[PDB]
Paper text:
However, diffraction quality crystals were obtained using mutants of the same construct, which included an inserted hexahistidine after residues S664 or I665 (recombinant products r664i6H and r665i6H, respectively), or by substitution of six consecutive linker residues (I665ADVAN670) with a factor Xa cleavage motif (IEGRAA; r665sXa). The three structures were solved and refined with diffraction data to 1.9 Å, 2.4 Å, and 2.1 Å resolution, respectively. Each variant of rIgSF-CTD formed nearly identical crystal structures (RMSD of 0.760 Å for r665i6H and 0.327 Å for r665sXa, with respect to r664i6H for 298 aligned residues). Thus, we performed our analysis with the structure refined to highest resolution (r664i6H). In each tandem, the IgSF and CTD domains showed an orthogonal arrangement, with their longest axes tilted by 90 degrees with respect to each other. Regions with defined electron density included the residues V579-G662 (IgSF) and K672–K736 (CTD). The 9-residue linker (T663-D671) between the immunoglobulin-like subdomain and the CTD did not yield visible electron density, indicating that this fragment was disordered in the crystals. The hexahistidine tag was inserted in this disordered area. The overall fold of the rCTD distantly resembles that of the IgSF domain, and both domains superimpose with an RMSD of 2.11 Å for 63 aligned residues, despite sharing a sequence identity below 20%.
The virulence of P. gingivalis is dependent on secreted cysteine proteases called gingipains (RgpA, RgpB, and Kgp) that are essential for corruption of the host immune system and acquisition of nutrients and heme – a vital growth factor and source of black pigmentation of colonies on blood agar. Gingipains are synthesized with a typical N-terminal signal peptide targeting them to the Sec translocon and are exported through the OM via a novel secretion system referred to as “Por Secretion System; PorSS” or following the naming convention, Type IX Secretion System (T9SS)7. Translocation of gingipains from the periplasm across the OM is dependent on a conserved C-terminal domain (CTD), which appears to be important for secretion of the proteins and in particular, truncation of the last few C-terminal residues of this domain leads to accumulation of gingipains in the periplasm. Here, we show for the first time that the OM translocation signal, a conserved CTD of RgpB, has a typical Ig-like fold encompassing seven antiparallel β-strands organized in two β-sheets that are packed against each other in a β-sandwich.
Residue numbers in the entry: 579 to 662, 672 to 736
The structure:
Amino acid sequence: VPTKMQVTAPANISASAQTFEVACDYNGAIATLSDDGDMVGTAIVKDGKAIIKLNESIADETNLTLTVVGYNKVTVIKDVKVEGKPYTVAVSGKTITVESPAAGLTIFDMNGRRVATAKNRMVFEAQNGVYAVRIATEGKTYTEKVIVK
């Protein structure tokens, strides 16, 4: 029968984060952040903590799952909120056009850095790579992920 381990982690993570710290009383447990499969970073617990280095930007996510697994331990799972229909996000060559009347718009580069903020509409002049767009309306934030060639 497996035993329990203690796990403490934040309930929220910045859209711009590069790391996520997990405390755990079982050294050698593995703590992983994921979006429905897509594993976005993993670290082993050493000296009571795992410092997860993200392997990609999570700015295109509104939630992530934290899972901590240990040998003969009960797995621990926690939901983590990521914080930065009625919109469009358009790509044309190196431009990204975002439109959503009354909404806060933000774009993040592939390192998670916030590169643009505007209300209602913006055209962003991008470079080759992958961007996240977050569209914050009253009640709800939507996201899209954009490839610029």
